Design a protein around this ligand. Structure first.
Ligand SMILES: CC(=O)c1c(C)[nH]c(-c2csc(N3CCNCC3)n2)c1CCC(C)C
Length: 126
């Protein structure tokens, strides 16, 4: 079995910015989810080899995880907050696509997503 290359976290020819919204996404949103008791399955790319999930990357073609998001934020990879919000939403959606309703992993994603929504509700104006 093989894992794919992880999502990129640096791309020198991609234009980058540091906005107050992106700062909030790191200092408030990511930090809140990262410290949560249910964060651990989401802190690095899914290791389909070790988890014995050979179909994971057959079903999930746009993988995303908080380790990737954290590095993107720390490296100022994004142009705007919407790009980063999309990454969080991709991460949650992938979990719901792959897994079964009520699975532990889905309950974990739901708990993190609730906090995400609470924090994004107060995203500052630019
Ligand atoms: C399939 C799924 O949606 C999953 C997601 C987002 N995460 C995990 C998971 C478990 S353990 C771990 N890591 C990652 C990297 N660092 C080591 C610990 N990730 C899964 C598998 C759940 C179940 C189907 C076996």
């Amino acid at each position: 079995s093989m894992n794919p290359p992880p999502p990129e976290t640096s791309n020198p020819n991609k234009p980058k910015r540091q906005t107050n919204q992106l700062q909030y996404l790191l200092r408030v949103v990511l930090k809140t989810l990262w410290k949560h008791q249910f964060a651990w399955p989401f802190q690095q790319p899914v290791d389909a080899v070790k988890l014995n999930l050979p179909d994971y990357y057959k079903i999930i073609k746009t993988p995303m995880d908080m380790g990737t998001i954290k590095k993107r934020l720390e490296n100022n990879y994004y142009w705007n907050a919407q790009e980063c919000i999309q990454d969080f939403n991709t991460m949650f959606t992938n979990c719901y696509i792959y897994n079964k309703p009520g699975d532990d992993i889905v309950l974990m994603a739901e708990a993190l997503e609730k906090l995400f929504l609470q924090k994004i509700n107060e995203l500052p104006t630019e």
